[PDB]
């Protein structure tokens, strides 16, 4: 997270103020906003469409052999 | 993280009825017709049996 005092002291500081705002942690940006949805789009595919806040039901069967 | 325990809630107090037995004759429309074959073919079985042997007794003789 942390390295270079010289540098670091200011570059630290920006990243700080970021977390120390609201209207997104300063700021957001369009760019990732478009990003995210896609990539969250493309998740749901890799583990099907279902939604696992809820779990899996079954039902239940017999036949006669003879 | 309001999720994880909702989920959690429903899914771990939740259990779900085991696949239903539908069919219990199996048992019973053999054992019953284990009779079928004892009984009704026992007897007859072993009553032809008898004079089988009670020929050949003497048939020995």
């Known amino acids: 997270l942390d390295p270079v005092q010289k540098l670091f002291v200011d570059k630290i500081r920006e990243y700080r103020t970021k977390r120390q705002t609201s209207g997104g942690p300063v700021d957001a940006g369009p760019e990732y906003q478009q990003d995210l949805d896609r990539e969250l789009f493309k998740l749901k595919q890799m583990y099907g469409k279902a939604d696992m806040n809820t779990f899996p039901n079954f039902t239940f069967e017999d036949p006669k052999f003879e | ?43 007859q079985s072993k009553t032809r049996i008898q004079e089988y042997e009670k020929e050949l007794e003497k048939m020995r003789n």
């Open chain 2, 1 to 43: 993280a309001g999720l994880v325990d909702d989920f959690e809630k429903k899914f771990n107090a939740l259990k779900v009825p085991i696949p239903e037995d539908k069919y219990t004759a199996q048992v019973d429309a053999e054992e019953k017709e284990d009779v079928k074959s004892c009984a009704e073919f026992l007897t």
